């Protein structure tokens, strides 16, 4: 019987021989938790026009946070965009008036979700009106909401007052 005896000895010298790898499929333009070599994090992988130095695998911003990474296998420049996040704003009239409620998102378009978009973010549960009236509920980007007329919540541009020549 031919016998092959493998002697495993761990000395003070650095380690080299290691087990196999995985290298699963890659996904882009989605929120996912990615682990590249000894780096981990959560963000959106998007290919940008930046060019990393051949000897520099990982990049960093002024905050020491990596905004992009290079595929350990294939050669590509992938920008790391954090997943969508923001504050939850609830615009509703007082309990005495009505129970109607309008949800508002900040710094993000409509994703999760009368779904309308504004400069401040996604606004659901409201109606867009072209007629500008006096501000009622402050929102942002020069936009105010109010409860009016079979009445609901509408979103109109904040008026600066009547015109006088």
């Amino acid at each position: 019987y031919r016998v092959v005896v493998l002697s495993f000895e761990l000395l003070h010298a650095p380690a080299t021989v290691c087990g196999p790898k995985k290298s699963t499929n890659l996904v882009k333009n989605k929120c996912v938790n990615f682990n590249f070599n000894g780096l981990t994090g959560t963000g959106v992988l998007t290919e940008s026009n930046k060019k990393f130095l051949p000897f520099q695998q990982f990049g960093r911003d002024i905050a020491d946070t990596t905004d992009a990474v290079r595929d350990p296998q294939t050669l590509e420049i992938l920008d790391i965009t954090p997943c969508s996040f923001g504050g939850v704003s609830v615009i509703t009239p007082g309990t005495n008036t009505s129970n109607q409620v309008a949800v508002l998102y900040q710094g993000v378009n409509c994703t999760e979700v009368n779904v309308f978009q504004t400069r401040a973010g996604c606004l659901i549960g409201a109606e867009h009106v072209n007629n500008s009236y006096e501000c009622d509920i402050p929102i942002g980007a020069g936009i105010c909401a109010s409860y009016q007329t079979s009445q609901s919540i509408i979103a109109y541009t904040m008026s600066l007052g009547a015109e006088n020549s």
């Binding site: 019987y1 493998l6 296998q73």
Partner: protein, 148 residues
């Protein structure tokens, strides 16, 4: 009446992504046992394997070994462990002599030929060579040390 922020929404990751380099530039472990001729029990060669990646799943799932056993380390855990130095011993011994290979063993081949320390963390592999080494008329090329 007014606008109130009741919370802060955050999008959770849908799935996890995994990426690494290739498996290329390995050490030819298959050629160690595939070598035509092996050294005698007293002549056993010691091969130093380092600076490569090792895949042990092919040797265990190939069903090409007669007996496979490890000491101190499980076979499934070898893939997740990095080793600095790997020495692959090669030699030929009798069938009944394979049982004497282990930490703190005895016998002729163990004491007078090859012995395993009690702390040996490696593994053992053997398969029947009767279809190669053994030939008509007998093969005396493989010897052993009887007395010491």
């Amino acid at each position: 009446k007014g606008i109130y922020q009741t919370s802060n929404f955050r999008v959770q990751p849908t799935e996890s992504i995994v990426r690494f380099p290739n498996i290329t530039n390995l050490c030819p472990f298959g050629e160690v046992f595939n070598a035509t001729r092996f050294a005698s029990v007293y002549a056993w060669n010691r091969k130093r394997i380092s600076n490569c990646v090792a895949d042990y799943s092919v040797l265990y799932n190939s069903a090409s070994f007669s007996t496979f056993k490890c000491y101190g380390v499980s076979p499934t855990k070898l893939n997740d462990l990095c080793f600095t130095n790997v020495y692959a011993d090669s030699f030929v011994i009798r069938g009944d002599e394979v049982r004497q290979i282990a930490p703190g063993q005895t016998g002729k081949i163990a004491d007078y030929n090859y012995k395993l320390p009690d702390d040996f963390t490696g593994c053992v592999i053997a398969w029947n060579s009767n279809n190669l080494d053994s030939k008509v008329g007998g093969n005396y090329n493989y010897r052993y040390r009887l007395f010491r």
